[PDB]
Design an enzyme around this catalytic site. Structure first.
Site, PDB file in Angstrom:
ATOM      1  N   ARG A 130     -19.398   7.195  -7.461  1.00 58.19           N
ATOM      2  CA  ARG A 130     -18.095   6.573  -7.547  1.00 58.19           C
ATOM      3  C   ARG A 130     -17.702   5.991  -6.179  1.00 58.19           C
ATOM      4  O   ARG A 130     -17.826   6.652  -5.157  1.00 58.19           O
ATOM      5  CB  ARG A 130     -17.074   7.607  -8.011  1.00 58.19           C
ATOM      6  N   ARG A 155       5.323   1.957  -3.344  1.00 62.93           N
ATOM      7  CA  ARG A 155       5.345   2.472  -1.976  1.00 62.93           C
ATOM      8  C   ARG A 155       6.773   2.404  -1.412  1.00 62.93           C
ATOM      9  O   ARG A 155       7.518   1.441  -1.661  1.00 62.93           O
ATOM     10  CB  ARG A 155       4.406   1.648  -1.083  1.00 62.93           C
ATOM     11  N   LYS A 172      -8.239   5.053 -16.799  1.00 66.38           N
ATOM     12  CA  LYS A 172      -7.689   6.240 -16.190  1.00 66.38           C
ATOM     13  C   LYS A 172      -6.288   6.485 -16.764  1.00 66.38           C
ATOM     14  O   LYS A 172      -5.454   5.589 -16.766  1.00 66.38           O
ATOM     15  CB  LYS A 172      -7.649   6.084 -14.669  1.00 66.38           C
ATOM     16  N   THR A 175     -10.243  14.967 -10.750  1.00 67.53           N
ATOM     17  CA  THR A 175      -9.280  15.452  -9.747  1.00 67.53           C
ATOM     18  C   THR A 175      -9.146  16.959  -9.871  1.00 67.53           C
ATOM     19  O   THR A 175      -9.268  17.504 -10.992  1.00 67.53           O
ATOM     20  CB  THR A 175      -7.893  14.814  -9.823  1.00 67.53           C
TER      21      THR A 175
END
Lengths: 522, 523, 516
Positions: A67, A114, A261, A319
């Site tokens: 990955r 952000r 995802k 994760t």
């Protein structure tokens, strides 16, 4: 051997228990595993792992997919990672029996919210208190307790009264009291230390950001140029997002697998259409855990893996796997159990992140993953899986489908060492994998991309035939079958006097892998 | 193109099989045509009413798969011309291999018998309650009457007791034995009626000791071998050694001739397992059993024996008292429709007609009606359960042919296939499939004429005889055989363009096993 | 023991086979039956059987229901039959362990088309035959008493004559005469029965005579009516209307006798209390290659609905003249039982034949042998899976009783029931163990016989003041009946169904109880 993961000795003649409960009662921790490791290992390649030398060791220890995380780095940097991956992979090519295909996966950075800088750089955010989230740039370079800036212009549209907003990937929690005319006013639910350009998550909000940022468009065109096998597309919230990714990859990238995802509530809510549109799914537990109550994520993981299993589409668990192995050479008991439980829930692949990308023990992380995944295999109850998937599909009559269900049935009845599938596109091998046989699937192909992409599927051991096409169709078949027999004997899957199932077309360039043979191993 | 009327058997392949047996029964519909082919074999006894080439042709067209010859009467010369006419009729269809239907020849022996003597032909009236003395003393052979009766079974006395029943002339006259002598019995006439010359005797419950094979049977079996019969139906089989005797007499020249054991008495039922193990197949002769055993037990004996045969994967034929009313009428009773149907549903591979086709007035209509009933009975079979039970009983092995045969049947249910095509030299691969009881018809393609004929013993096998020479490329030799079976299935209405069929073959010339299964769309 | 059918000894701890196929494989003709006879026996009562003495022997030999055929005979004649049936039945009352309830059934005449009178003329096939309404018998001329054939027959119709023995083909009508040609031939006597195909017959389902017979049945307190020629739901509704308020508890069994009844079966069943399948009548219009399907379908649908189904006609016909039945007859009966029929009915065999007594005993023998071939595991499993998902406590209790009966190899399920409802619910799931339905309601006891596997017993004891003592007394009565009949012995287990607390009616309480 040519690697600690190469030889995976199987015993084919165990008593299959009549019940799941009995299968559990018979587990024995003093018994060496008697099964192959069937789940895929995906490793994130970065500073700790991108040398040709380390990579060779990782391939030996069971890495199937590299990955590349495009959250950071330039194209030049990632092109050089890919080049080292391909050098290490190709270093085993001289012996076609010991060659392991290794896929390359590009994981996009994806749409992001952000903050703006403190002044540039820390501020203490006070349990209780109030905080105004402001939106025009005249407040971007100045934050601190009073105000805070961020770049997602439509927050106010998508947030309601009582919504959570998380800042710095979970650290800071906020509760919106009022939407204040292109502003937000928030009670600090949690509070901590606040920095500059920290990530923001909107639990349960239908975020409006494009399917693909312009940075992702360029990263996906680079992936096409670099000939990658698959893309992990970030923050997928609806079927259209997937279609947009597919549009970007276009005609030249049409054979590239798109793994969506699932990283927020909307993605879970719209999973059926996302799954419909995708080649595969990745469950990002960390990100789900910000966006969704801690204690529901395990439900969401189990549901998504079950639905993928039912559709025969690859699902990757990601994760928070062996994250403690960034700093230590062994994982915790809990990490072992979490990884095991993802394999037992029906995950096709497990992905490692910082543990292989940047930590102190990338090699040991791969090895430990292989050990855990292989031990988990003892607790998989194959009979039920197969019986239930068989029972949960239509008539079809698609020759390739009918023949896949048959091969798997035959694999149980005959206690076969393997199902050997000859396949150009991989499709028949994939159709066999969805029915979850106990025996390994040896997918023999001449197409190097097929061979690399086969790692997305539980139980497919891809082998790349490099011999030219023989003229006589029957002896081309016997040669590919022979290559499979030799790999399977070398990896200890089976030996002389065992039985294997063999799937093929009938006569050259046929439509359909529609031919099944039960064949003794010589 | 239809040269039959049993030839076209239009199937509808795309309905769900019910999840329960009960639902399957509840969904039966008398108003819709059968959607299945007729899978049970039809065996017709050929005699004076049926032996002409012309009637035989129409009998083949109407569904006859096997010609039975009853050696109970007739000479070798009479039976040899019957057999010749059967083959002339059969071969009249060879000119078109797609219309050609193999027809087997079965020889049914007379078998061991107990017979009475002469009434000095004359009859005497036996009256209930009266005493009848049975004597072995041959000084009386020709002078039977209402006081004394001579039988030719010299051991009766060894084998019977006080209380024992003795039936004469096919169960018409019943005697119970009241005193047991050495050379003689004295009995009360229980039933009564007119007793003729040289009539058959049955001893219910008695372990009859006559030879497995009479003098007449040895002659008949050798003739069978010379005439190249496909099967023998061996009478009055009581035990394994009876079957071995028949097999020894057929010998090496007769080794490929199938031996069907006729179960005709109590001892046969009791020793059924050893008889079944030694036989190639079984015939349940309900009429004879009805004399030998309490009438109301015969249905249990039938269901039992058919079950054990299905479990063992061995052909079982139901015979006697099928469409008997059609000896004299052009339609059967409701009761007979039902009894035939229930033998099909019990699991019978074949049904046999007797006088209905041998000597009656409507031989052709009996065949037609047998075909109608058997095809309607098919709708009522719950195929899924038979297969699931046979799959779950089978001894577990990794043997490739068997895994392949089971897989092929499984695929046929899951793709709702129109047929299972099996290329077979000896017939074994096709028999292995048939024993799992698919709903879909098995088209067994063979170049062996004898294999083609003997296949009719198994429910659901439609044998076709490939005449073409062996092609040089094995793959081309397969596609030639497969194409032939496709043409046949299309012509008979089994399936059509778009449907799917399962194909079983070997992998390369000779090799060993029929270990290849393909799921093939119908072109 | 009073009578050949009383002791039906059982052995309980079998191990049922894992598959239907193994069940068939293990059948054994030499072993005596190890199950009770569970199928009801209905006998037609007539000249050969209506004497008190004969009726007594028939009861002892297993007769459960007495059928009165109102096709013939006056109300006076039938009243006396019923009185004889009740005299015979009540002769056994004096030992309550030995007392077997016997139901009375009234079978209606229904509409009937019948020929006139002239010897047998042979209608040779193909040869003319015109039908006349002009109130003469050869290949040209035949009369009959249905004034509207012409209105309901259209060129190409078929007319069956004498129970389908002949079939004529009309192809030219003349609004009073019909010109037919013989399609099927045979000999034709005098004063015969006639049928037409499909729904052609417009005659009322309940005639003026049927109305009088049904009201008679109410005043004579019959248990059930066999309603002739039911062709649709509204025929059932008309019968129910006539029986009315007073006759509300009389069970209506619709006879299916023709293609139309089969076609409209689902509505007839819905509207009826049960069904009788008249195979012989079905075989008039419907060919032999289809009748067995109709029978299997109808018994299947009845079983799925929980409604009694009776197989009738062509049972042991040959026993009219002979004391033994043929092999084929034995098989035909056994196959009705295995098909799922609750009762089997005898006609001419008991009504007017020479061996009424032997036909009963031989029916009992066959029905008891057929029991070995029933695969009780699969019946229950399937009926459980096909039942609508209700929460109804009485239904859950009945299903639990049956499941416990298998798990415990129980000798019986004992059901204390005023109305019989709970015993009927249990019988629907087809246990192996017998259902001993203990009731103080005599009608409930009699009507119970419509259901496979119910053994009704009439408790004559007065109600005990304490409820639990009243329960133990009835259960103890059941234990005694069951020991006397050989169903179980001390140390076995039985399932017991009751209500909770006095005078309920709602049986939602199951107990697993050792035999003391």
């Amino acid at each position: 051997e040519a690697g600690t993961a190469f030889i995976q000795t199987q015993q084919l003649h165990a008593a299959m228990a009549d019940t799941f409960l009995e299968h559990m009662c018979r587990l024995d921790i003093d018994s060496p595993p008697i099964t192959a490791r069937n789940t895929g290992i995906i490793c994130t390649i970065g500073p700790a792992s991108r040398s040709v030398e380390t990579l060779k060791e990782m391939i030996k220890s069971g890495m199937n997919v590299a990955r590349l995380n495009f959250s950071h780095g330039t194209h030049e940097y990632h092109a050089e990672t890919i080049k080292n991956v391909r050098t290490a992979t190709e270093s085993f090519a001289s012996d076609p029996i010991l060659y392991r295909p290794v896929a390359v996966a590009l994981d996009t950075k994806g749409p992001e919210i952000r903050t703006g800088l403190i002044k540039g750089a820390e501020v203490e955010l006070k349990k209780g208190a109030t905080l105004k989230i402001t939106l025009d740039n005249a407040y971007m370079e100045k934050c601190d307790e009073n105000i805070l800036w961020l770049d997602y212009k439509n927050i106010c549209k998508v947030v309601e009264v009582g919504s959570k907003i998380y800042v710095d990937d979970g650290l800071i929690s906020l509760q919106v009291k009022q939407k204040g005319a292109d502003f937000l006013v928030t009670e600090v639910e949690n509070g901590g230390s606040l920095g500059s350009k920290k990530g923001v998550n909107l639990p349960g909000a239908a975020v409006d950001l494009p399917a693909v940022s312009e940075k992702d468009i360029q990263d996906l065109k680079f992936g096409v140029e670099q000939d990658v096998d698959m893309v992990f597309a970030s923050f997928i919230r609806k079927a259209s997002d997937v279609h947009e990714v597919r549009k970007v990859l276009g005609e030249k990238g049409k054979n590239i697998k798109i793994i969506s995802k699932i990283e927020n509530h909307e993605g879970v809510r719209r999973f059926d259409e996302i799954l419909e549109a995708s080649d595969g799914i990745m469950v990002a537990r960390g990100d789900l855990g910000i966006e969704i109550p801690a204690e529901k994520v395990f439900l969401a993981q189990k549901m998504m893996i079950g639905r993928c299993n039912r559709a025969g589409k690859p699902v990757i668990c990601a994760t928070q796997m062996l994250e403690s192995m960034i700093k230590k050479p062994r994982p915790t008991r809990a990490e072992g159990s979490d990884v095991a439980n993802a394999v037992l829930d029906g995950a096709d692949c497990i992905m490692l992140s910082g543990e292989t990308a940047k930590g102190d023990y990338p090699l040991e992380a791969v090895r430990m993953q292989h050990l855990i995944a292989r031990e988990a295999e003892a607790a998989i109850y194959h009979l039920q899986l197969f019986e239930e998937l068989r029972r949960l599909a239509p008539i079809t009559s698609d020759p390739t489908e009918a023949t896949a269900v048959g091969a798997v049935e035959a694999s149980f009845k005959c206690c076969s060492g393997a199902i050997i599938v000859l396949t150009k596109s991989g499709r028949s091998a994939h159709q066999v994998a969805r029915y979850r046989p106990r025996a390994p699937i040896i997918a023999v192909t001449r197409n190097p991309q097929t061979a690399r992409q086969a790692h997305l599927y539980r139980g497919i051991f891809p082998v790349l035939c490099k011999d030219p096409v023989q003229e006589a169709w029957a002896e081309d078949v016997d040669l590919r079958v022979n290559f499979a027999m030799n790999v399977g004997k070398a990896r200890g899957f089976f030996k002389k006097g065992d039985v294997v199932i063999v799937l093929t077309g009938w006569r050259p360039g046929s439509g359909f892998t529609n031919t099944m043979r039960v064949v003794p191993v010589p």
